Design a protein around this nucleic acid. Structure first.
Lengths: 305, 1129
DNA sequence: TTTTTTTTTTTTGAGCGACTGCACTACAACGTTGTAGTGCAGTCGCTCTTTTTT
């Protein structure tokens, strides 16, 4: 069996939308599979459970938290949404659904006290950019004069930081002097300061080069494990990467922790897109992923504050 | 204790045999079986010799029972040969032959034992319980037929969900808050009580009363909190205790924390500042008021609702599970033990035990360490002190490692306290004497090394034939036990595991690199053997550390297998690839599923191949055409022909065998294919098997057939095996990297030291935690004894100063909390230097130590060899000609008979009505009504049906006018079945021209096409009847859908005969009748005896038209002779 | 009683226990100040077996 990675001919088109870049930098291996060769591994949907939901975990809990955060960002009645979710049966019966709604309302109110502390009314604006002879057309929703404001009921992850960094690059390139902020759970915050037009266009050209590199060859840029390796190796005080053996062992420990998780958290390596390329994580491909993450994910932790 | 001789053991009463590790236990069972069969021993013998169906042997594992049955059969055959020859080559067989005086009767008894070996009573525990429940079902109360279920977790989860519905739903907020703080849902409660729901229900120490509910306990704890709140509100505003140096002056602020705490009693959790108001803690840092003592009495026991909910769950869920299995009629594995214990618990069932004493008046129970208390209660109910019945408990208390499954060593200690005699096996026949001396040196450092009084350790003796076993290295003779002490003061868990896995992989590659050059050898006397990869085995305890060993060993180019891998084949990526392939076969029109299935690792294509397949439309057309051919094979031939054609046309099996690491993937693909073919025969639809495969992917449940198998047997691999899966096996070289890793038991479930009963303490008392940790440490010591005694030549140990405590440098290490350090440090806490001195203190010729070296030079050397040329034989000709035994069908107003429903089933119903009815007697209307009731038709059709039947019977069907009523019972013969032979290949062109030469109805009717049929032809003639010395044939055709008027004349009937091709059937009927009348009647003429063939169309018979409905035909009497000559040869 | 379409994923650990820094008073050395002991808060390691019965 020959290797799946092969140099393919690919010509970069004139008009590349922002949605294509967002779908690329959300998952680069999936974007190499389902868009270049159009191979999307469609797994079958989950079967109907045999009993009523006694607890809330997974996609249903995330959707409940998302609707509760979208309701509390406008200071709406949480009790009406409680009756709406209880009338659909998505909540546990009786008092346990009330306890779940109370602790989720406490957590979403704690998040909303940080979200609407610096919230201004902003409208969606248009994006028309010309970078390296490539046209980027798109729309940015809820653009406030303070900058970019996004909120999601999730954990501190590198993929959301990459998405916020891409939105900040596509926002600062056409006017828009201001910071970009994203508020996650457990006091997690992604912040990017405003930059000049030259640095924003240079980093946007770097992301465009990464996009045109990911369509020819599978761009082995792991967001979570590569970001963990980088933030173990990066030093924000001196703006330089350490090269001692202790940091090189702790970064390998963080990479093995984020790639293959424990028996309670699904790791990044347990995915249908990564098992097709390699069956076992070789150290050569590990060093390749490390080099690609050092090449691409470095302005994520360089401009983080 | 005493030594055990198999020819001097008294088989009276109860005896307890303690067979040590490596001893000939399976040989001793066969020796006692031969002793019970032949009746040997003299004064210590049985009072009468017993047969094969009276000797009961009980062993837990079914494969162990099969192996023991085969070994006992081989021993019976060998003793029969040695008794017929009066000589043998074995000393125990020599003493067995010397004990008997007669030889012919003993040889005849051994021959009868060999012939009755199929009916041997060597069963398992659950099998013996099921056989006794089905045999004596009256005294026990068991159904005759029941359905055993393999998995009981679904009904258990359903009963737990029912308990959570009927107990946790009507609770108010102040109770449901505490219930949510204890468990999130019923899944956490089931995960807590799943070790107690199965097996014997334990006795809860200090249970709640039966009338106390959750609300009463909640109100009691609320009143207990409110009393302390009242006593704090009354005694507030004063301070009389002396201020100490440890006591800071901010305690009044803590009193402010107690000032805001008393608002409502809706909460359940008190403040931590009450811990500052304890009289036992303030004195150590003068308490005179009893408010501090009331606070200390409040904090003496934890305020928890958990114990009452656990008690109600253990009272409700087991009862609901038993009620559901009694409603469905199902049974379980432990349910057989519970049913036999409840049958022996009754008063009449004791007599049933006497029936068991009538059934087998002996018992030899193997593996008595794996004995549930229900099993020992049954065996004490049957075979306690009754005469003429013997009980032989053959076991080992040092091997009881199945406490997680339901076994218990306190039951063995109760059994040892109950019985009087004890016997032990001194000689060990497995390992080298160096390893035996190492085991007897390590486990005899202190007294009672297994920490229990009823489990004594004795020094075993090595074998005389195996005293020359030496594992020799390149340098010199390697010692038996080599404790690789990892150097350092204090280390973690993952770092210690990684370093010892690297040291073990380095030792494996050093033994394999020097073993392939003739340096490291296994020497028995002067005989030598090189160490292959199958000799070295790593003994682990968990799956995560097994994967750690496999990852640390595959880095140095060393392949390794996991024998204890119980993972399902449906949870791998290959099952998802097979699901995608089946979805692409079932739906090849949509290109998305086919593109997702072609890019899998099973096909093995590059991205350039997928890109050129997406670009070229003709190659995708070829792929869609061959997948449609695969779908046609899958709909016609099944699962495995389609999978074999896919693996042969794409040649993916050769590509997976050429790829390194793809042989395991190919064996998993073959096992998934075998399971899909096994499940595809039980399903009719094609999408149902795909839904079953997707369900079994979504269901990770482990069955005995759906587990992963061994990938290869020819290539030697390093066999990683758990300690429980290594019981009773044998390995030359054993590496134990994680024998110092220990885990502390948190739950309080112990056994009492006096009553020997399972006591579950739901409250967090420290005495119950210590008594459970003592049993956990005894289980770890038993696991250590099991893992140490499996090596033959050399065992290696990984020792390190492991600290489970979170403090890095506390001055003491936790190796005394493990099993190895309790024997090394003699049960005393020491340091890393103390551990090193305790290791270096016990240094002999067999026991040595070395430091753990981290270092790698080279992975391995492949040393491959060329493969010889091989070919496959090819069949020269066809396997068989077209031989098939076929029939004629294989070669091809408001109520009226016209309004009858036309179908195959009403046609067969009318055929059965014309078959069963007598032609002489008049038709009775109530009989027609009874036949319509039996058939299921409408009752309104009956009075028209009987007059239509009589109108058919009154109409004559002959050239002279002979009706059916004139035929007697001896003249008629209904449904004559004939077989007609033909030895020539039946050519349709040579037959149709011969038919058309004489038959006038073959003017039209273009000829049918059929293959060359050589063999037999079946046929079922409806009626044959004689009249005035002339034979006649009658057949029934009753479909007749297209006619309702009187248009069924002779021309329309001839057109129907030409269309449905009944001419060939009638010609074969004339040939069969001609051959029958030629064979039966002597001096037979075809023109004299045969009269013609009548076809009776039932819906065409009218009262006014005698010719309509009947069709009489006579052959030309020359076609029959030529057809007989053609069919004969 | 006829008939229309549609290709976008998302989420997921937290309690137990230690390390370290800052504050806070008690008490002895030189009215005031340095040293010691304890409490609270931010930050971080760790860790969650084994199996077979008709």
């Amino acid at each position: 069996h020959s290797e799946f990675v092969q140099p393919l001919p690919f010509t970069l088109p004139e008009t590349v939308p922002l949605e294509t870049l967002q779908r690329f930098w959300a998952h680069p291996v999936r974007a190499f599979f389902q868009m270049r060769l159009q191979v999307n591994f469609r797994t079958e949907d989950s079967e109907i459970p045999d009993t009523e939901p006694f607890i809330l975990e997974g996609l249903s809990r995330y959707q409940i938290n998302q609707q509760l955060l979208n309701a509390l960002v406008e200071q709406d009645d949480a009790e009406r949404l409680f009756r709406r979710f209880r009338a659909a049966g998505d909540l546990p019966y009786g008092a346990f659904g009330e306890i779940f709604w109370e602790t989720q309302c406490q957590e979403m109110q704690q998040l909303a006290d940080r979200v609407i502390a610096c919230r201004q009314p902003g409208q969606s604006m248009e994006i028309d950019l010309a970078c390296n002879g490539v046209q980027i057309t798109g729309w940015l929703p809820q653009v406030q004069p303070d900058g970019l404001l996004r909120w999601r009921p999730s954990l501190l992850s590198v993929a959301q930081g990459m998405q916020l960094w891409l939105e900040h690059l596509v926002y600062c390139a056409s006017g828009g002097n201001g910071e970009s902020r994203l508020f996650l759970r457990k006091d997690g915050e992604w912040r990017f300061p405003p930059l000049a037009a030259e640095q924003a266009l240079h980093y946007l050209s770097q992301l465009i080069e990464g996009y045109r590199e990911g369509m020819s060859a599978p761009l082995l840029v792991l967001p979570e494990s590569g970001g963990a390796w980088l933030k173990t190796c990066y030093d924000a005080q001196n703006d330089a990467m350490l090269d001692d053996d202790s940091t090189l062992q702790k970064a390998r420990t963080k990479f093995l922790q984020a790639y293959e998780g424990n028996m309670m958290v699904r790791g990044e390596g347990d995915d249908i897109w990564y098992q097709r390329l390699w069956r076992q994580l070789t150290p050569e491909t590990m060093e390749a992923i490390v080099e690609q993450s050092q090449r691409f994910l470095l302005p994520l932790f360089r401009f983080n504050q | 204790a005493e030594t055990l001789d198999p020819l001097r053991l008294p088989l009276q009463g109860e005896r307890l045999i303690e067979a040590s590790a490596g001893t000939g236990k399976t040989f001793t069972i066969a020796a006692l079986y031969l002793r019970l069969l032949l009746g040997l021993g003299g004064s210590a013998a049985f009072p009468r010799p017993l047969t094969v169906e009276e000797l009961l042997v009980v062993t837990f594992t079914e494969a162990a029972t099969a192996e023991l049955r085969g070994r006992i059969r081989s021993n019976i055959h060998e003793l029969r040969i040695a008794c017929l020859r009066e000589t043998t080559d074995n000393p125990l067989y020599e003493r067995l032959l010397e004990e008997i005086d007669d030889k012919a009767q003993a040889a005849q008894w051994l021959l009868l034992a060999e012939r009755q070996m199929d009916e041997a009573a060597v069963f398992t525990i659950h099998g013996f319980c099921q056989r006794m429940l089905n045999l004596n079902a009256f005294e026990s109360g068991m159904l005759f037929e029941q359905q055993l279920i393999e998995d009981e977790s679904l009904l258990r989860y359903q009963a737990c969900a029912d308990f959570w519905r009927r107990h946790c739903y009507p609770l108010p907020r102040e109770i449901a808050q505490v219930v949510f703080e204890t468990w999130k849902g019923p899944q956490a409660l089931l995960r807590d009580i799943n070790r107690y729901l199965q097996g014997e229900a334990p006795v809860i120490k200090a249970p709640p009363p039966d009338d106390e509910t959750l609300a009463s306990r909640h109100a009691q704890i609320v009143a207990r909190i409110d009393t302390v709140k009242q006593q704090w509100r009354d005694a507030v505003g004063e301070l009389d205790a002396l201020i100490e140096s440890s006591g800071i002056d901010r305690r009044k602020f803590n009193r402010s924390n107690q000032a805001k705490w008393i608002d409502k009693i809706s909460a359940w959790a008190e403040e931590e500042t009450n811990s500052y108001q304890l009289p036992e803690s303030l004195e150590k840092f003068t308490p005179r008021h009893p408010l501090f003592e009331a606070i200390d009495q409040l904090l003496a026991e934890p305020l928890s609702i958990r114990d009452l909910v656990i008690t109600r769950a253990l009272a409700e869920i087991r009862e609901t599970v038993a009620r559901e299995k009694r409603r469905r009629g199902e049974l379980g594995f432990d349910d057989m033990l519970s049913r036999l214990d409840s049958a022996l618990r009754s008063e009449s069932g004791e007599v049933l035990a006497a029936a068991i004493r009538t059934r087998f008046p002996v018992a030899m129970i193997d593996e008595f360490q794996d004995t549930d208390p229900q099993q020992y209660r049954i065996f004490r109910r049957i075979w306690h002190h009754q005469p003429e019945t013997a009980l032989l408990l053959i076991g080992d208390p040092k091997q009881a490692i199945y406490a997680f499954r339901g076994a218990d060593i306190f039951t063995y200690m109760k059994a040892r306290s109950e019985v009087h005699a004890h016997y032990t096996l001194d000689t060990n026949w497995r390992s080298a004497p160096g390893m035996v001396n190492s085991v007897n040196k390590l486990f005899s450092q202190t007294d009672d090394a297994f920490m229990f009084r009823e489990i004594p350790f004795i020094p075993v003796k090595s074998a005389g034939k195996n005293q020359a076993l030496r594992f020799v290295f390149k340098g010199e003779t390697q010692p038996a036990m080599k404790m690789w002490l990892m150097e350092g003061e204090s280390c973690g868990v993952g770092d210690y595991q990684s370093t010892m896995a690297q040291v073990c992989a380095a030792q494996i590659r050093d033994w394999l690199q020097a073993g392939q050059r003739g340096e490291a050898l296994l020497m028995n006397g002067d005989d030598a053997r090189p160490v292959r990869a199958s000799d070295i085995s790593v003994l682990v305890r968990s799956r995560q550390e097994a994967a750690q060993v496999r990852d640390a060993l595959t880095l140095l180019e060393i392949p390794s297998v996991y024998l204890s891998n119980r993972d399902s084949v449906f949870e791998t990526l290959e099952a998802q690839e097979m699901l995608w392939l089946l979805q692409a076969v079932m739906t090849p029109e949509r290109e998305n599923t086919l593109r997702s299935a072609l890019a899998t690792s099973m096909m093995g294509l590059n991205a350039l191949d997928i890109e050129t397949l997406n670009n070229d439309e003709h190659a995708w057309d070829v792929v869609v055409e061959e997948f449609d051919g695969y779908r046609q094979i899958w709909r016609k031939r099944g699962v495995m022909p389609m999978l074999r054609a896919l693996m042969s046309a794409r040649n993916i099996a050769e590509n997976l065998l050429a790829t390194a690491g793809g042989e395991r993937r190919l064996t998993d693909i073959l096992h998934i294919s075998e399971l899909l073919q096994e499940a595809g025969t039980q399903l009719e639809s094609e999408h149902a098997l795909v839904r079953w495969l997707s369900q079994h992917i979504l269901e990770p449940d482990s069955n005995a057939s759906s587990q992963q198998m061994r990938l290869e047997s020819d290539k030697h691999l390093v066999q990683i095996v758990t300690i429980h899966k290594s019981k009773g096996l044998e390995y030359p070289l054993v590496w134990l990297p994680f024998i110092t890793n220990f885990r502390v038991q948190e739950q309080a479930f112990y056994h009492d030291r006096h009553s020997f009963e399972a006591v579950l303490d739901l409250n967090a008392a420290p005495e119950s935690v210590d008594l459970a940790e003592a049993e956990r440490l005894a289980e770890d010591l038993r696991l250590l004894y099991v893992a140490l005694t499996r090596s033959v030549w050399h065992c290696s140990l990984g020792v390190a100063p492991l600290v489970r405590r979170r403090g890095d440098k506390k001055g003491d290490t936790d190796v005394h909390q493990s099993a190895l350090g309790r024997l090394l440090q003699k049960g005393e806490p020491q340091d890393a230097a103390g551990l090193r001195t305790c290791i270096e203190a016990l240094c002999d010729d067999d026991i040595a130590w070395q430091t753990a070296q981290t270092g790698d030079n080279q992975p391995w050397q492949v040393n491959d060899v060329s493969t010889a040329e091989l070919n496959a034989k090819t069949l020269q000709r066809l396997p068989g000609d077209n031989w098939r035994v076929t029939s004629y069908s294989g070669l091809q107003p408001t109520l009226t008979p016209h309004q009858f429903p036309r179908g195959a089933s009403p046609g067969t119903f009318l055929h059965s009505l014309f078959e069963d009815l007598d032609f002489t007697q008049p038709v009775d209307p109530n009989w027609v009504r009874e036949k319509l009731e039996l058939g299921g038709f409408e009752s309104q059709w009956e009075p028209v049906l009987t007059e239509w039947i009589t109108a058919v019977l009154q109409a004559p069907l002959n050239e002279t006018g002979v009706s059916l009523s004139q035929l007697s019972a001896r003249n008629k013969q209904v449904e004559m079945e004939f077989y007609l032979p033909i030895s020539e290949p039946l050519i349709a062109s040579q037959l149709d021209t011969l038919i058309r030469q004489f038959d006038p109805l073959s003017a039209g009717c273009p000829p049918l096409e059929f293959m060359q049929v050589r063999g037999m032809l079946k046929g079922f003639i409806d009626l044959v009847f004689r009249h005035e010395g002339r034979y006649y044939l009658l057949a029934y055709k009753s479909n007749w859908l297209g006619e309702d008027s009187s248009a069924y004349t002779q021309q329309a009937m001839a057109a129907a005969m030409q269309a449905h091709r009944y001419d060939l059937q009638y010609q074969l009927y004339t040939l069969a009748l001609h051959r029958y009348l030629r064979h039966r009647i002597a001096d037979y003429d075809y023109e004299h005896h045969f009269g013609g063939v009548i076809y009776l169309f039932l819906r065409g018979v009218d009262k006014e038209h005698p010719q309509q409905g009947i069709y009489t035909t006579r052959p030309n009497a020359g076609l029959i002779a030529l057809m007989d000559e053609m069919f004969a040869g």
